[PDB]
Amino acid sequence: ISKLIAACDQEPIHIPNAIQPFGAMLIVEKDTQQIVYASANSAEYFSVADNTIHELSDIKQANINSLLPEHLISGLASAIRENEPIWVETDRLSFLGWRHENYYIIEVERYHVQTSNWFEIQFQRAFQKLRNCKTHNDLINTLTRLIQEISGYDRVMIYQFDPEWNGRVIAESVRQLFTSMLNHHFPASDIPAQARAMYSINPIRIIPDVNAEPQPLHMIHKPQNTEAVNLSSGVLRAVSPLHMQYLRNFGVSASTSIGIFNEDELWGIVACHHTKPRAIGRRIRRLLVRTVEFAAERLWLIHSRNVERYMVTVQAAREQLSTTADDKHSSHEIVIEHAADWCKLFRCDGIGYLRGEELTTYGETPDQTTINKLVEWLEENGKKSLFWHSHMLKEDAPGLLPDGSRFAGLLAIPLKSYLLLFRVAQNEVRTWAGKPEKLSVETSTGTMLGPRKSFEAWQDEVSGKSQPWRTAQLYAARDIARDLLIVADSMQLNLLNDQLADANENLEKLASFDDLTGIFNRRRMEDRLESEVKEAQRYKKQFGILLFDLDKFKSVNDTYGHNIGDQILQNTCAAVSETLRDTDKFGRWGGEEFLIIAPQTGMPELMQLGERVRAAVEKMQHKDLPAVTISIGVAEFQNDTRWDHMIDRADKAMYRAKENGRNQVCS
Amino acid sequence: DDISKLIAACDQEPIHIPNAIQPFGAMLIVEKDTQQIVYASANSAEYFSVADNTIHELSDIKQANINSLLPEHLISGLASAIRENEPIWVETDRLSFLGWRHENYYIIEVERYHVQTSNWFEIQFQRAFQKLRNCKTHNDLINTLTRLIQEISGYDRVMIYQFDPEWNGRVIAESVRQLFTSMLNHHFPASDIPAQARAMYSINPIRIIPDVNAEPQPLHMIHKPQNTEAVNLSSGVLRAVSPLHMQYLRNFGVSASTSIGIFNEDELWGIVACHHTKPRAIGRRIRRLLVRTVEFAAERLWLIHSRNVERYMVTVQAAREQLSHSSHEIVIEHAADWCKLFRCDGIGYLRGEELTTYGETPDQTTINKLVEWLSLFWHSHMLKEDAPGLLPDGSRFAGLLAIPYLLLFRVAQNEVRTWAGKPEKLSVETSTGTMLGPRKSFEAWQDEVSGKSQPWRTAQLYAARDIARDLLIVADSMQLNLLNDQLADANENLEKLASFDDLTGIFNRRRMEDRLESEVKEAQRYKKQFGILLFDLDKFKSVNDTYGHNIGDQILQNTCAAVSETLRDTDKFGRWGGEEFLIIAPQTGMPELMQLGERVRAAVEKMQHKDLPAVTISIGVAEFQNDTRWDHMIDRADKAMYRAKENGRNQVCS
Ligand SMILES: *C/C=C1/C(=C/c2[nH]c(/C=C3[NH+]=C(/C=C4\NC(=O)C(C=C)=C4C)C(C)=C\3CCC(=O)O)c(CCC(=O)O)c2C)NC(=O)[C@H]1C
């Protein structure tokens, strides 16, 4: 069927070599100055200008300077730019002429001087009423009422195009005979691209009678070129018979349409229908078009304002995000508090926020698993786009949602994880003015799609689509998302200061204490002993060291076990630690041997301390554990150079204790 | 003070009720319920004599009937109209009537008219709309508007006059045909158009003065009215002009003028002012042409402005995109673009104690006085007035935008304004009292404004907020990276401490115990083969006592480095206690285990002395023989090692 629809582009509507009979036309060669073509009814129009003209053939012996007003000839001689029509009227005739390539085209219509202030009053009323429209709907509806009152046509409709060139009636004024066509959808094939390009050449098209026989152009003088002359810039250009039969099927006897332009883009048309033939003069034409231009600018102003108003609204919501942010709320608390507002702001059914492994959801959302399938596919899709968005997910990302999913729209903002905005598919029921009909029709250009027969309402539905994401919403969603990224970063700065604090604290704990025992490791004993020697050498202080070791401990390991032995080491440190004085430092020196540094202690008290420790390890509680004894060497600071000599004395003393029976204390 | 009172007195004159009209028409005032004519302009008789033969003098209108003076269509229209101040236009062959309802009255203006037939107006409408539609920038629109208004109106001088927020004005466009002096970019004072005068444009968008020297015609009473309060004439075109404004135009060198209000919705944005050097009337149709043109051009200009905003937001989005290096690196890299984006001379970014500056800025200390002295943003275009004593005395800065810091600075622009005439304090006696008179000279006089900058457009505030928060994200990312680094090192050091001997660098005893237990479990599940090597340093105490602990520790480190080169990659090497070390050898039978023990024993033997004593180790060896606990293996290997030391040290034993 696609080939039939595409075939419409064969018919050359700019060169039909015929006109509608509500006027007449001449075609003049610029250099030759001769009339080379004239419409078949030229005689009944120019006989007003020249009495001699009775038949068409008389125009062959006629001169243009007898048929055209001096102002029109002067105007054509003067114009440099092409296709800029000149309007010159006389007492009984209204002339419209322009230059095109090597030809001058001149249309003539019957004209009656009508004097009134009607047009000016209507223009003032139209501008005042359009100026008072402040919303989209008001403008288009006021436009339809104004066009109906000005033109008198029984049905006026604003017909907006889709990006695919299909259309919808978005405003309508309908009287007693016509049926209402509001919100009905029409297919692209109704207006081929060639036909749409006409409005850019002449903004108004007029068909005063669908059944009026077209008047062909007859040759009069042999042109130099002979190729058909382009008639696009005028108003008399004959209508394709396909579109006439189209209008008949629509129940329309006469129509007029005006293109709606946004700069150079064709945004829609004002379509007017009547149940009987209906001519409109040049002044009512100019009124209609001037009105439509003003209304159009007004509508673009409303559109460009609602963009700025929406921006202000987004700024307001983002301002609300940071009123909660100072109160130290989490980002998940913020999403739950404001997500209902965002759904209105973004015209979406649901929101999901993912940061790390945690997920916050509001409204209609896929499951956490499906959300993660989405996120991962978003990463592996790898688009560098600041956001990713689709109103038909099943087509853009197949196999991604579950079987039967209702979601169609997704807007995803990547952060450093993701912000997701979900839109349920809206199952819009569309009412078309007639089914699409595969009807072939042969024409002088070839075979093409024929005009449909029925215009009665027919509904169809489109599934798997949502509303499209307007660009203003993409930027708002991204900015909201980044306002969340700022919240999370601060909370994580607090968390990371906490965790780094704990890490450094535990690191300090491990830098100074043996893991199994809990007392000071060997490096810390080495440090304390060296500084104790330095102090004792400067100020002649008195201190001693106790270097003890566990007796036959291998027998404990092999007879009992390593676990029992380790509890014995812990028991021995627990028993020794309560014995010690507050100034003394106690540490694990190597393996099973331990060190005690006793400052401010002379030799008798030092030996006594060794006795308290040795007796302390004996009495400590077994709790079903083997009996254990320690052997203590003892040394005192005797004007030593290095602490190594002191540990040497204590070590020799301790091994001397081992030989005299493993329980004694020796120095 | 003295002149402020004079200017304020201008608002005393009730210009809506002058009880007189300009003489380019005539006016009747009729009571609705009484149906009688109660007021008639003093020249009414030369107009209504067209309708009625009997009317020769003004006094005759008292015995006339309205239904003899007015067209039937105008009477029907007035009877039908409910809305007030909505004029009706009804014309005949010789007269053009404009009448409206106001409270209990009908007001009717009549002007001389003759039917002209042409397509000229329609062609002018088309050409004007096409030319305005082709304007895509602000300047193009206003200049095209000035050319169109001058060509349509024929006035010798046309100018677009834009108002300030304080009601002063400036000429922003001009088209001159004659020997007028140009008034482009000249400033005019508010008193030139009092508020009462500006409010007129909201009732009738066009004001017409066809002759500044035309004698005004007062209204004469005709039938005794019921109310007697002066009737409001604002909706029409015949309302007489204040003689102060007539004298103003004379001093301005203007014989006739026409002005059209320019409306942005309901706000008066400016006027189209037209002047002629000779008297000049314009018919109703040229009036309607001028006004429709001005409204169309106005809508077009508001659309151009709304698109520049939408476009500037696209620009801001582009710069923010380019933003997404340190945050200070980004500020230095991108601040030149931001100065264009924000129309500012300088930027300062403060983060903690560190300050990055670009362009014209105060010093760090003054910036700190600013921060300390300091809503989502705070902004002012007159710093000297809004925050005295804050800057140095001679400081050139006048504009400040502060985003919580991000600082945007605007140098004071010493804008020289050219005014049309010196200020002139002249008193003038008036029916309301004494008020300011129009100045006599309009010649150029200059003044200068210091201590002010451009005002901060709303779009720039929001842009500054968005840029600032995009920078905060950068700094947060950099500092999150730094803190993740510091936490990484802190946690990894914990591994090194919980797993390795500090002095040696190999595994501590806890990790060796764990590995031994898991190796035993593996061997018990899968019937694998592994063994342990437990060695000790010989006569090491002699090293400590003869040499030192520092030498002893370097010997332990040397010995671990020498042993570690011997081991295979699967083997684990750790410090068991003191000088006793352990090797875990998986996938190793007893002979290969003994061989490895020999390689280790020889490794410690030959290693480098470096002026240090020679060292030997004695190694015990054990093999996994279906043991229950690893203690049994360490026990066997320990006994073997003890057998090696007594039978002569530096040996391998199993
Ligand atoms: C294969 C060719 C096809 C075709 C040709 C065709 N159609 C036109 C002109 C028009 N069609 C219009 C369509 C509508 N009128 C409405 O009122 C609505 C909806 C409410 C629609 C969709 C309109 C508006 C025009 C312009 C003329 C007019 O004002 O009616 C042309 C151009 C004819 C001409 O004037 O040169 C052509 C060639 N139409 C098809 O359906 C197929 C068969």
Ligand SMILES: *C/C=C1/C(=C/c2[nH]c(/C=C3[NH+]=C(/C=C4\NC(=O)C(C=C)=C4C)C(C)=C\3CCC(=O)O)c(CCC(=O)O)c2C)NC(=O)[C@H]1C
């Ligand atoms: C104490 C009262 C004062 C006063 C009164 C006054 N002025 C007007 C009318 C107008 N003044 C206008 C000013 C300008 N015309 C220009 O062409 C320019 C420059 C581009 C300026 C500033 C305009 C435009 C009007 C409107 C009438 C007109 O178009 O000429 C009125 C109102 C008069 C009336 O409409 O009845 C009044 C009461 N002017 C002062 O200077 C002081 C003395």
Ligand SMILES: Nc1nc2c(ncn2[C@@H]2O[C@H](COP(=O)(O)OP(=O)(O)OP(=O)(O)O)[C@@H](O)[C@H]2O)c(=O)[nH]1
């Ligand atoms: N369970 C356990 N055993 C350890 C620990 N540190 C060292 N050992 C054991 O200590 C033993 C070496 O201690 P030695 O002093 O040489 O031998 P001993 O049995 O105490 O003999 P004498 O001191 O001469 O009475 C080895 O078998 C090590 O396994 C430890 O933290 N836990």
Ligand SMILES: Nc1nc2c(ncn2[C@@H]2O[C@H](COP(=O)(O)OP(=O)(O)OP(=O)(O)O)[C@@H](O)[C@H]2O)c(=O)[nH]1
């Ligand atoms: N410098 C230093 N010495 C240590 C360290 N750990 C243990 N020691 C020394 O180890 C020595 C005791 O080791 P032993 O095995 O009992 O004595 P030995 O001389 O090696 O005996 P044999 O092995 O039979 O030759 C003490 O002098 C401790 O100071 C350490 O980290 N650094």
Ligand SMILES: [Cl-]
């Ligand atoms: Cl036309």
Ligand SMILES: [Cl-]
């Ligand atoms: Cl008027």
Ligand SMILES: [Mg+2]
């Ligand atoms: Mg021991």
Ligand SMILES: [Mg+2]
């Ligand atoms: Mg040893």
